Each structure stands twice: as structure tokens, then as C-alpha cells.
């Protein structure tokens, strides 16, 4: 039982209390209603384009107006739907029907008119061309990618992505409307634009449409690529882990020898969410207004996540080496398992002859240390659940020969095993 | 079912773990018996059409739809006899001794819709342009497609070298100089995304197909359209190289592929009914033309095979393999181990036999009279338990370290993975 | 450097029961 007893003068028994709570909701859509946001009144579009360009050059933008323009602008982008496109029971778009981003979601317009005010960076006296509209649309969404990317020591990389975005949208099929270095300066005023919910929702809607439908202005995705599989890093690492190790998703979990994995394994593999479906709302469920906090986040699946990347460092994977470890979720214990698991999967492959010249040769081949969960488990038990010196040698050699990031797995490995 | 686990305490729970997936592959075969087509805006008067497009070129003004209609008219200009009968995916294009155009290989349906030819840049040719002048522009326009595709880091100096060669080609006979120098680099800077345009790819491939089969005076236009050939089939292309480097036949090589994963991939790229063996089929340019969807022959589709090929190439020190981008999804560590055993067999060893003799009698005596075999390699792997040998590591390390590792190349993977 | 590890995931219920039928922290 949880009660334990202390002998302070008289004998005393105390129960131990620690606070714990769980709050996980899943993205499946039962009402069969497409995701909706409420925006402002329909814009003048040509004038709405003018207002936001001026605001862009001036680094002052109104989030509500910018959202309203983006909802109106999702009409210029049109393409035919290759196959019937259904997610969570919704028919969205039948094969051969031309569709827009407006087709994936529901935009609710309010009677209230937007400010659509001009600042000082408008040089155009005429109505804008479509490439221009697309260039602005891409630049505005690209703010989302920049807001997310903010963090410590992420500087030269942020400017490099901003330059890459600027190079797009200045060349055909896009026209240069903002000159250079404007995107970085507006980002400084709009660095937390990701938290704005409608802006994120619009970015996901654009990304969904561009992934399924090939278009001339598909480059707009460079802003919205981040919305894809957002806040599902635990699930994504798991799929990568499975494929790099060349194990079946089930067989891999058999190697997870710990009680903690149980809650996490149930959480990330809950049925009814269209994880397998190629173009479902699941891919952008966080961007769109569904589910709230993600159960597939790395913190949500902390033990699994830590074991995946510790094995990744053992195998020299750069992605694992720079990923941030979840400290709450027992990193040391995960690291030990990762060493035993890494030893098994590093430098070893299961090879069998599958191609022969003749059927007879196949028959001759049929007439004819070991990789198994049971083998690894016993080997761990034999060493008393303690890392081997070789495991430690391998971890340190990988971590030390790397530019260890602040809270990365490499830094953890380095700080933990170094003498 | 089968693929399920038991995940609970004080109760029993069975769950199939569900993982992200998003792929299916379309094949290039032509069953409808219809040549790939993009219907074009308006029928053009040749001389008038040239003047606008020459102007647009000089103006760095991008008019893709018009450029496409002009290129179709210019296809009338290039004509040659077909050497032998031309049979493709059930579509036969001409017969031996029959004159043909690039326009005769595909079908363009002409619409009565109007289109906008603007004179934005300076053209001084008051006279009607000569056929060479047309060819010079046509080559310059197509050469944009190649320039758009070659974008990436440290490719600046490379783009410039290619543009200079193209300019030199079209300023020299049989072509005439119409754009002076350094204009091609600047227009490439203006449009670096010409490759994404679908109508542009279609045209480049059509030209490339015509020029490979038919010898012509202006066949040099093929620079810039050469990239369309076997585009997005680098997995297939890599396998072809692999066969040649090791000097084995397609089958013998596949026997060395000792892994279950290769099976799906080998079946995919060698699916029958696609004219891979045919020399001048639509297949070579299937990606560029319309008849394509993703590609069964891309490096990702044949990921395991692709990685094994380049890991072996790295073992043998092929620079191309060292600089290729590894597919992380397709089990690179396991592929690297097989590649080590396969590289060991094929690096520094050859199968040599006497084939030339002084007299027939010597030949008969030779006919009267350690081992390279898949079985021998498989056993060697089995004896070492499927674990990479120390020598394999040493060789991998020596090759990767003494090379300028590119970002996600096989060279980088080898360095990061085996380094102590 | 030490962890308490136990098999918790099995292919079938029968395998689970068998593991239940079967240095010190």
C-alpha cells in the first residue's frame, strides 16, 4: 500500500501525496462539420491587398484584417481534385471537381467591416495582378513559420529561412512586391503571430490544399510546411524510428521494456484518428481548430520519445543528437535501455536470400547473436540493468564529436557520462 | 490482427499501432493510344510571333503561355526524315524515310481563344526573321528549363558555367547571336522556377525526344532539354550505373540483394508493360510529358535499392555515390552493412578469363580445362552474424573522412555513423 | 546508469501469461 511509517519519538504512519492530472482530447470529428473560424466582413480585395502591402513595408499589420484578406484570397488558387477526398466522414471534394482552399473549411463572415487602412508603403495606383496577390499571400503566411522558429541561438538560421522565402515570391510565378529585408523586420513586430488562432488555422488550410492539389503557387507551402504534423513529434519520431531500425511497428514496441511506456503507447495509438489516411485532417489537426492539446506531442509521449532519440544518438543520427530531451520523463532510465537497444540495431542487419536464378535454386536454399526481444531483455538482466562500459564509450564518442546544443540529447549524454 | 500487442496491467488491451502513411504509385504506360497533349491558346503567324517573343526575351518579361504557342509553331521549322519505323506505347510515329517534326510526336489541339503577345523589349529586326534566328531563340528559351532545375546551395558558380556554354552554342554556327552575353544568366535569375511550370516541361521533353531520334542541324538545342530524359527515375538510373560499375548483368546483380525489403522495390521498377528497354519510347520522357504520376522509378520509391547502390559506391570510392542524398526512411544502417559486404567483394577484384588465343588449337586446349558468387557472400555475412566487419568500418571511415561531405549525402551519413 | 526494466509488451495474450508464470535495487 502507499502508506509508510516514520518513528519520530512516537510511531507515526503518513500517506504520501503528490499532485497529478491528465487532460488529453483526440482530433476525430464526429459532428461531420468542417472546421470553422469567424472572421470580419468580406474585403474589397484589391483595396485589402493595398492596405496589407503598405502595412507590410511599414512592419505594422492588423491580425484581423490580414486574416480576412487571406480568407478572401483563397479563391484565386483553384485546381482539380485528383481523387475523391474524404476525411473523418466528410466528403470535401469529389474526383474531377475544381476546388479551392475555401472548400476544406468553413469561413464565417461577420457584418463588422475591417479597418483596411493604408500606412506608407503603397506605390501601386492600379488593381493588383494575381501573381502579386499570391506573393503577398505567401509572405504573410511565411510569418507563421518565422514566429514559430523563434528561440535562443536560432539567429543566422532564421535570417537564412527569411532570405530563402524572400527569394521565392520575388521570382516567377511570383512578382517582387516587398523589396529585400522587409520580411525580417515585420517578423520582429509579429514574432508571436503563431499564437493567433485564426492565423494558424488559415496556414493549415492553405497547406492542406497545396499538399493534395498541385498548383502554380504551391511554393506558398514554405510558410505553411510547419503546420503539417504540428505538435505530433512523438508520433513522427516513432514512424521514423520504426523505418530506420527496419522493424514492424509492433515488433519495435516489444523492445520497450518498461512500465512507463504503457500509458504513452495507449495514448499515441488510440484508434479512430485517421493516422494512416494520406490526406486527412489529421495531418493539420492542430493547425485547424480540432483537439486542443495534442496527445502525440513529444512531451505527451516523453518516454517513447526519449528512448527513440537515445537510440538515435547511439546510431549517430544527427536529428536525435539535436532533439530536446524531456527531463520529466526519466531520461536516465531511457538512456540505459537505448544503449542496449542501440547495440542490437547498430552495425547489424537481418539478411536473407530472396532472389534466385531458378525455382530449383530457391528450393535448394530452402533446405538449410540472434536479434529478438527476448535476447535483449535477458542480456540487460544479466548485466543487472546497468549500462555496459562499451555502451558508455559509444555514447560519449558520439556526443563529444558533436556541437552539442543547449538542451539536446547530445548535451545530456555529455553532461551525464564524461569521465 | 497478428500486428498487435498486449499493453495493459490489471486488464488486457490489444492495439494495432497506427503510423503515418501517404504513398501510391502511377505507371507511365500509354493505354488510351493518345499522344500526350496540352491544347494551345491561338494559332500564330510565324514572323509576327517571333517578334513578340524576341521582345519578351530581351525585356526579361515572362510570358509562359505565349512562349508555349510559339514553341509549337517553331516545331514546324525543325524537320527530318525518320531513320527507322518508330513504335511506342502502341502509338506509331511515322515510318522509315518519313519526314517528321517535333509537333508530329505529340498532338496539340488548337483553340480559337485569344492570347497576349507584348513587345516589351527591344527588337530591331524590321525584316522577317530567318530560320536560324528562330532556332537560336527556341534553344535559349528551352535552356531556361535546365537553369531553373539546377538550384541549391553552392550551385552559383555551376549555373554560370552552364549558361556560358549555352550562350556559346547559340552564338555559333548554325545559330546566330541574338542576345549578346550575360543576358542568359540574368534572365535565369529573373525566373529560377521555370521548371515548376507544367507546359514548359512538356515542351522541353517533346523537343528532346525529337532531337535524340532525328539528326538535325539545330540538334544542339538539346542542351537544356537533356535534363527531361529519364527525369525522376534516378533510382532506375542508379541501378543501371551499379550494374556497369561492378560489371555484372541485371539479374546477377539482383541475386546479391539479400534483404526482404528489396523485393517490393525490384518488382516495382521492373514491372512489365513499360518500355524501359525500348530506346526511343515515351518512357524516357514520361515524367516531362503528361503520362506520369510521382514515379515508380524515383530514388524514394526504390529507396532501399538506391541506398544499397550508393553505399557500395562509397565503398568503392565513387564520388557520385558519396555526394548523393541518402533516404533516411529506407533503413540506411542495414543497407550500409549489406553494402559493406557487397563492396568488399566488388572492390579491387575482377573476374578474368582468357578470351584471346594465338591459334584455334590453343583455344580448344583452354576450353578442355576466392570465388565470386551470391552464395559465398551470403554465407560470409552469416558467419559474421550480419554484423559489419572491422575492415568494413575502416574503409567506410577512410572514404568518408577524406571527402568534402555534402549536407545530407551518403558521405555525411558515413562520417556521423562510424567515427570511432 | 541503472534501470529497472521488465517486459510489458507481448505479441499475444498467451505470451503475456507465460512471462507472468516465469544487481538488486
DSSP for A16-76, please give it.
Answer: ---------------S----EEEE-SPP-SHHHHHHHHHHHHTT---HHHHHHHHHHHTTT
- Residue at which a domain ends, from B227, B245, B280: B227
Task: Decide: A75 and A100 in contact? Cβ < 8 Å.
Answer: yes
C-alpha grid cell, residue A28: 476525430
Can you state the angle between helices B64-74 and B198-213, rounded to 10 degrees?
20
Cross-chain Cβ contact B5/C11 below 8 Å? yes
Phi, psi values for residue A405, rounded to 5° = -80, 165
Whole-angstrom distance, CA of residue A164 vs CA of residue A181: 11
Of B226, B211, B214, the closest CA to residue B162 belongs to: B226
Whole-angstrom distance, CA of residue A355 vs CA of residue B251: 9
Task: Decide: A166 and A173 in contact? Cβ < 8 Å.
Answer: no
Q: Write out chain C residues lying below 8 Å of A337, CB-based.
A: 3, 5
Cross-chain Cβ contact A261/C9 below 8 Å? yes
Q: Write out chain C residues lying below 8 Å of A264, CB-based.
A: none
Of B132, B204, B146, the closest CA to residue B175 belongs to: B132
Q: Which residues lie closer than 8 Å to B222 by C-beta, 6 or more apart?
A: B207, B208, B211, B212
Q: Is residue B23 part of a domain?
A: no
Is B4 an 8 Å CB contact of chain C? yes
Whole-angstrom distance, CA of residue B27 vs CA of residue B272: 10
Q: Which residues lie closer than 8 Å to A331 by C-beta, 6 or more apart?
A: A306, A310, A325, A412
Does residue B209 sit in the same domain as residue B237? no
Of B235, B198, B400, B253, the closest CA to residue B317 belongs to: B400
- Is residue A413 within a helix (H) or strand (E), and if so which, with residue range? helix A409-416
Whole-angstrom distance, CA of residue B152 vs CA of residue A312: 28
Q: Give residue A348's Cα distance to chain centre.
A: 30
Of B228, B173, B206, B232, the closest CA to residue B101 belongs to: B206
Q: Which residues lie closer than 8 Å to A275 by C-beta, 6 or more apart?
A: A235, A282, B18, B19, B20
- Is residue A4 within a helix (H) or strand (E), and if so which, with residue range? strand A3-8
Cis peptide before B174 (omega within 30 of 0): yes
Neighbours of B163 (CB within 10 A): 23
Q: Which residues lie closer than 8 Å to A44 by C-beta, 6 or more apart?
A: A116
Phi, psi values for residue B210, rounded to 5° = -65, -45
Whole-angstrom distance, CA of residue B296 vs CA of residue A223: 29
Phi, psi values for residue A383, rounded to 5° = -90, 15
Rounded to 10 degrees, what is the CA torsion of A72, A73, A77, A83?
-40
Q: How far apart are the first and last CA of chain B?
A: 43
Is C11 an 8 Å CB contact of chain B? yes
Environment class of A400 (CB within 10 Å of its CB; exposed 0-12, middle 13-18, buried 19+):
middle
Apex B35 CA angle, B34 and B38, nearest 5: 110
Task: Decide: B17 and A269 in contact? Cβ < 8 Å.
Answer: yes
Is B13 an 8 Å CB contact of chain C? no
Task: Decide: B56 and B325 in contact? Cβ < 8 Å.
Answer: no
Which residues are registered as beta bridge partners of A99?
A79
- Residue at which a domain ends, from A194, A211, A226: A226
Task: Decide: A306 and A387 in contact? Cβ < 8 Å.
Answer: no
User: How many CA atoms does the CB half-sphere of B416 hold within 13 Å?
Assistant: 25
Q: Which residue of A has its CA nearest to C4?
A: A385
Q: Which residues lie closer than 8 Å to A349 by C-beta, 6 or more apart?
A: A246, B259, B333, B334, B335, B337, B338, B386
Of B96, B318, B146, C3, the closest CA to residue A303 belongs to: C3
Neighbours of B59 (CB within 10 A): 16
Q: Write out chain A residues lying below 8 Å of B420, CB-based.
A: 393-394, 397, 401
Alpha carbon of C21: minimum distance to chain A alpha carbons (Å): 15
Of B211, B200, B217, the closest CA to residue B141 belongs to: B200
Rounded to 10 degrees, what is the CA torsion of B320, B323, B325, B327?
70
Apex B79 CA angle, B76 and B80, nearest 5: 160
Three-state DSSP at A15 gives strand
Alpha carbon of B8: minimum distance to chain A alpha carbons (Å): 7
Is B264 an 8 Å CB contact of chain A? no
Whole-angstrom distance, CA of residue C6 vs CA of residue A155: 44
Q: Is residue B21 part of a domain?
A: no
Strands B99-100 and A85-87: unpaired
A248 DSSP assignment? -
Q: Is residue B385 part of a domain?
A: yes
Q: Is residue B12 part of a domain?
A: no
Whole-angstrom distance, CA of residue B61 vs CA of residue B118: 9
Q: Which residues lie closer than 8 Å to B313 by C-beta, 6 or more apart?
A: B242, B245, B320, B321, B322, B324, B410
Q: Is residue B25 part of a domain?
A: no
| CATH (domain of A172) | 1.10.3570.10
Is B361 an 8 Å CB contact of chain C? no
Alpha carbon of A234: minimum distance to chain C alpha carbons (Å): 19
Cross-chain Cβ contact A254/C8 below 8 Å? no
Q: What is the 3-state secondary structure (H, E, C) of chain B?
A: CCCCEECCCCCCCEECCCCCCCCCCCCCCCCCCCCCCCCECCCCCHHHHHHHHHHHHHHCCCCHHHHHHHHHHHCCCCCEECCCCEECCCCEECCCCCEECHHHHCCCCECCCCCCCCCCCCCCCCCCCCHHHHHHHHHHHHHHHHHHHCCCCCCHHHHHHHHHHHHHHHHCCCCCCCCCCCHHHHHHHHCCCHHHCHHHHHHHHHHHHHHHHCCCCCHHHHCCCHHHCCCCCHHHHHHHHHHHHHCCCHHHHHHCCCCHHHHHHHHHHCCCCCCCCCCCCHHHHCCCCCCCCCCCCCCCCCHHHHHHHHHHHHHHCCHHHHHCECCCCCCHHHHHHHHHHHHHHHCCCCCCCCCCCCCHHHHHHHHHCCCCCHHHHHHHHHHCCCECCHHHHHHHHHHHHCCCCCCCEHHHHHHHHCCC
Q: Which residues of B312-329 are buried (b: 16+ CB within 10 A; e: fewer)?
A: bbbbbebeebbbbebbbe
Whole-angstrom distance, CA of residue A172 vs CA of residue A216: 10
Whole-angstrom distance, CA of residue A55 vs CA of residue A71: 18
A275 DSSP assignment? S
Q: Write out chain C residues lying below 8 Å of A332, CB-based.
A: 1, 3
Candidates C4, C7, C9; nearest CB to A385: C4
User: Count H helices, E strands: chain A?
Assistant: 17, 8
Task: Decide: A278 and B21 in contact? Cβ < 8 Å.
Answer: yes
Q: Which residue of B has its CA nearest to A217?
A: B196
How many domains does the structure of chain B reveal? 2
C-alpha grid cell, residue A309: 532519440
Of A194, A217, A201, the closest CA to residue A281 belongs to: A201
- Per the listing, cell 545530407 goes with B408
- Per the listing, cell 526524315 goes with B81
Q: Which residue of B has its CA nearest to C8?
A: B7
Maximum CA extent, chain B: 93
Environment class of B36 (CB within 10 Å of its CB; exposed 0-12, middle 13-18, buried 19+):
buried
Alpha carbon of B7: minimum distance to chain C alpha carbons (Å): 5
- Is residue A108 within a helix (H) or strand (E), and if so which, with residue range? strand A106-109
Does residue B86 sit in the same domain as residue B209? yes
Q: Give residue B293's Cα distance to chain centre.
A: 15
Q: Write out chain C residues lying below 8 Å of B4, CB-based.
A: 11
- What's this structure's resolution in Å? 3.5
Whole-angstrom distance, CA of residue A338 vs CA of residue A376: 11
Cross-chain Cβ contact A373/C5 below 8 Å? no
Environment class of B346 (CB within 10 Å of its CB; exposed 0-12, middle 13-18, buried 19+):
buried
Does residue A147 sit in the same domain as residue A164? yes
Environment class of A4 (CB within 10 Å of its CB; exposed 0-12, middle 13-18, buried 19+):
exposed
C-alpha grid cell, residue B142: 528551352
Q: Is residue B28 part of a domain?
A: no
Does residue A205 sit in the same domain as residue A73? yes
Q: Is residue B300 part of a domain?
A: yes
Q: Is residue A167 part of a domain?
A: yes
List A residues 140-199 in contact with B (Cβ-Cβ < 8 A): 167-168, 171-174
Which residues are registered as beta bridge partners of B99?
B81
Distances (CA, A) of A398 to A237, A291, A417, B413: 20, 38, 11, 13
Is B9 an 8 Å CB contact of chain C? yes
Q: Which residue of A has its CA nearest to C9?
A: A254
Cross-chain Cβ contact C1/A392 below 8 Å? yes
Maximum CA extent, chain A: 90
Is B278 an 8 Å CB contact of chain C? no
Q: Which residues lie closer than 8 Å to B61 by C-beta, 6 or more apart?
A: B55, B118, B120, B121
Does residue B257 sit in the same domain as residue B216? no
Does residue B335 sit in the same domain as residue B237? yes
Of A324, A326, A322, the closest CA to residue A304 belongs to: A326
Sign of CA dihedral B28, B33, B35, B40: negative
Whole-angstrom distance, CA of residue A225 vs CA of residue A144: 10
Cross-chain Cβ contact C8/B7 below 8 Å? yes
Neighbours of C (≥3 Cβ pairs closer than 8 A)? Answer: A, B
Task: Decide: B201 and B145 in contact? Cβ < 8 Å.
Answer: yes
Q: What is the CA radius of gyration of chain C?
A: 12
Q: Where are the alpha helices (DSSP H) in A213-358?
A: 221-224, 233-245, 249-254, 261-268, 302-314, 318-322, 331-345
Does residue A194 sit in the same domain as residue A283? no
| CATH (domain of A233) | 1.10.3610.10
Candidates C2, C8, C11; nearest CB to A259: C8
Alpha carbon of A25: minimum distance to chain B alpha carbons (Å): 18
Task: Decide: B175 and B220 in contact? Cβ < 8 Å.
Answer: yes
Alpha carbon of C12: minimum distance to chain A alpha carbons (Å): 11
Neighbours of B219 (CB within 10 A): 16
C-alpha grid cell, residue B41: 491558346
Whole-angstrom distance, CA of residue C11 vs CA of residue B4: 6
Phi, psi values for residue A214, rounded to 5° = -70, 135
Does residue A192 sit in the same domain as residue A284? no
Is B404 an 8 Å CB contact of chain C? no
Alpha carbon of A172: minimum distance to chain B alpha carbons (Å): 5
Whole-angstrom distance, CA of residue B200 vs CA of residue B288: 9
Which residues are registered as beta bridge partners of B15?
B5
Is B416 an 8 Å CB contact of chain A? yes
Is A386 an 8 Å CB contact of chain C? yes
Of B261, B228, B254, the closest CA to residue B239 belongs to: B254
A384 DSSP assignment? T
Whole-angstrom distance, CA of residue B106 vs CA of residue B126: 33
**Domain residues for A402?**
229-418
Q: Which residue of C has its CA nearest to A379?
A: C5
Q: Write out chain C residues lying below 8 Å of A258, CB-based.
A: 3, 5-6, 8
Of B225, B402, B209, B400, the closest CA to residue B315 belongs to: B400
Task: Decide: B166 and B139 in contact? Cβ < 8 Å.
Answer: yes
Task: Decide: A93 and A80 in contact? Cβ < 8 Å.
Answer: no
Task: Decide: B266 and B257 in contact? Cβ < 8 Å.
Answer: yes
Does residue B294 sit in the same domain as residue B351? yes
Which residues are registered as beta bridge partners of A3?
A15
Does residue A184 sit in the same domain as residue A318? no
Q: Which residues lie closer than 8 Å to B334 by C-beta, 6 or more apart?
A: A246, A348, A349, A350, B259
Environment class of A309 (CB within 10 Å of its CB; exposed 0-12, middle 13-18, buried 19+):
buried
Q: What is the CA radius of gyration of chain A?
A: 27
Alpha carbon of C24: minimum distance to chain B alpha carbons (Å): 23
Which residues are registered as beta bridge partners of B110?
B40
Does residue A210 sit in the same domain as residue A144? yes
Does residue A255 sit in the same domain as residue A219? no
Whole-angstrom distance, CA of residue B251 vs CA of residue B272: 15
- Residue at which a domain ends, from A203, A226, A249: A226
Of A397, A399, A402, A401, the closest CA to residue A415 belongs to: A399
Whole-angstrom distance, CA of residue B183 vs CA of residue B141: 12
Distances (CA, A) of A128 to A45, A177, B261: 9, 10, 53
Can you state the angle between helices B410-417 and B303-316, rounded to 10 degrees?
80
Q: Which residues lie closer than 8 Å to B285 by C-beta, 6 or more apart?
A: B205, B206, B208, B209, B228, B229, B231
Amino acid at each position: 500500500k502507499i502508506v509508510f511509517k516514520v518513528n519520530n519519538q512516537v510511531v507515526s504512519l503518513k500517506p504520501e501525496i503528490i499532485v497529478d492530472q491528465h487532460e488529453y482530447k483526440y482530433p476525430a470529428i464526429k459532428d461531420l462539420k468542417k472546421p470553422c473560424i469567424t472572421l470580419g466582413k468580406a474585403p474589397d480585395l484589391n483595396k485589402a491587398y493595398k492596405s496589407v502591402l503598405s502595412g507590410m513595408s511599414a512592419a505594422k499589420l492588423d491580425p484581423d484584417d490580414v486574416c480576412s484578406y487571406l480568407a478572401a484570397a483563397m479563391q484565386f488558387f483553384e485546381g482539380t481534385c485528383p481523387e475523391d477526398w474524404t476525411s473523418y466522414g466528410i466528403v470535401i471534394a469529389r474526383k474531377g471537381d475544381k476546388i479551392t482552399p475555401g472548400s476544406l473549411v468553413e469561413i464565417k463572415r461577420t457584418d463588422v467591416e475591417g479597418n483596411w487602412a493604408l500606412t506608407g508603403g503603397m506605390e501601386l495606383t492600379r488593381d493588383p495582378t494575381v501573381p502579386e496577390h499570391a506573393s503577398l499571400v505567401g509572405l504573410l503566411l511565411s510569418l507563421y513559420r518565422l514566429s514559430k522558429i523563434s528561440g535562443q541561438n536560432t539567429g543566422n538560421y532564421k535570417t537564412n529561412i527569411a532570405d530563402r522565402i524572400e527569394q521565392i515570391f520575388e521570382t516567377a510565378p511570383f512578382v517582387k512586391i516587398v523589396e529585400h529585408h522587409t520580411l525580417m523586420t515585420t517578423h520582429k513586430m509579429c514574432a508571436n503571430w503563431s499564437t493567433i488562432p485564426n492565423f494558424r488555422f488559415l496556414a493549415g488550410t492553405y497547406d492542406m490544399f497545396f499538399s493534395r492539389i498541385e498548383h502554380l503557387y504551391s511554393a506558398i507551402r514554405v510558410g505553411t510546411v510547419v503546420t503539417a504534423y504540428e505538435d505530433c513529434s512523438g508520433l513522427v519520431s516513432f514512424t521514423g524510428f520504426i523505418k530506420q531500425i527496419n522493424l514492424t511497428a509492433r515488433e519495435a514496441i516489444l523492445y520497450f521494456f518498461h512500465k512507463n511506456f504503457e500509458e504513452e503507447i495507449r495514448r499515441m495509438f488510440e484508434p479512430g484518428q485517421e493516422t494512416a489516411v494520406p490526406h486527412s485532417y489529421f495531418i493539420h489537426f492542430r493547425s485547424l481548430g480540432l483537439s486542443g492539446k495534442s496527445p502525440y506531442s513529444s512531451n505527451a509521449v516523453g518516454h517513447v520519445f526519449n528512448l527513440i532519440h537515445f537510440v538515435g544518438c547511439y546510431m549517430g543520427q544527427v536529428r536525435s543528437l539535436n532533439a530536446t530531451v524531456i527531463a520529466a520523463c526519466a531520461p536516465h532510465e531511457m538512456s540505459v535501455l537505448g544503449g542496449y537497444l542501440g547495440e542490437e540495431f547498430f552495425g547489424k542487419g537481418t539478411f536473407e536470400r530472396r532472389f534466385f536464378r531458378d525455382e530449383k535454386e530457391l528450393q535448394e536454399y530452402e533446405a538449410a547473436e540472434t536479434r529478438s526481444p527476448e535476447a535483449v531483455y535477458t542480456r540487460i538482466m544479466m548485466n543487472g540493468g546497468r549500462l555496459k562500459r562499451s555502451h558508455i564509450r559509444r555514447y560519449v564518442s558520439v556526443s563529444s564529436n558533436h556541437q552539442a546544443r543547449p538542451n539536446s540529447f547530445a548535451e545530456f549524454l555529455n553532461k551525464t557520462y564524461s569521465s
